[PDB]
């Protein structure tokens with residue numbers, strides 16, 4: 272149950288990020304090819320809901336861990352009940368990513384090893400121990416430790432032919448938060464919406480742009496991967512990658528046009544805790 276730690280030599284890829292899961296869409300199309308996820312217990316991978324088809328979800332993807340070729344048997348897919356990509360079509364919002372989180376329940380128990388390990392989740396005893404915090408620590412205190420009102424150093428991971436690349440980003444959670452959120456208006460399809468908070472709800476964290484540093488941006492293939500805070504050799508998931516303003520894997524023209532506003536948006540796991548806590552209640556993670 273020691274979450275968020277590497278399991279030791281100075282190896283690469285899944286040795287350095289052993290919670291990462293790779294998801295492939297079984298019947299792919301443009302914008303619907305791949306996703307990422309995080310191992311969160313021996314039976315569960317956390318990802319984005321938009322990675323699946325709404326009908327027969329369980330047979331719509333394959334998932335692999337540890338950089339393996341083999342795919343794991345998926346017993347059930349649990350979407351957050353509030354997720355509905357079509358929910359704001361009325362308002363001229365063609366895709367709406369509020370509550371874009373889902374849990375993959377695997378039929379078979381994972382065996383943890385050097386390349387397969389769980390990441391810590393917010394508001395758990397695993398996170399308390401990982402941050403070397405006292406047993407009096409509350410969920411609010413973990414939130415203060417992990418997401419202070421500042422630009423927060425964080426990271427995500429991109430994958431390509433079993434190779435992982437770690438990318439450092441900053442969560443704009445202080446005085447730049449409003450500016451980061453307002454930049455949703457640069458996203459194709461989001462430019463006409465009068466009140467941007469209709470697209471950027473209280474569920475989201477915001478990264479990207481060039482201040483305080485030049486953050487790399489996500490691609491659609493990174494959807495569902497963990498947004499992670501690294502403290503003293505431990506890794507805590509704080510978010511799930513949901514959607515971005517610029518897809519730098521295709522249209523690199525655009526990011527060069529609007530670098531100051533090229534943001535990525537992530538589901539804040541502190542904002543979906545009732546759902547995580549209930550669905551993971553039997554996984555020995557010790558939610559507070």
Ligand SMILES: Cc1cc(C)c2[nH]ccc2c1CN1CCCC[C@H]1c1ccccc1
Nearest residue numbers: 458459489490491494513514515516517518
């Ligand atoms: C879904 C999704 C998920 C992730 C992690 C992404 N990362 C980068 C883009 C991207 C999209 C695509 N995007 C979603 C919001 C509306 C804009 C749209 C878009 C379309 C074409 C170019 C740029 C943005």
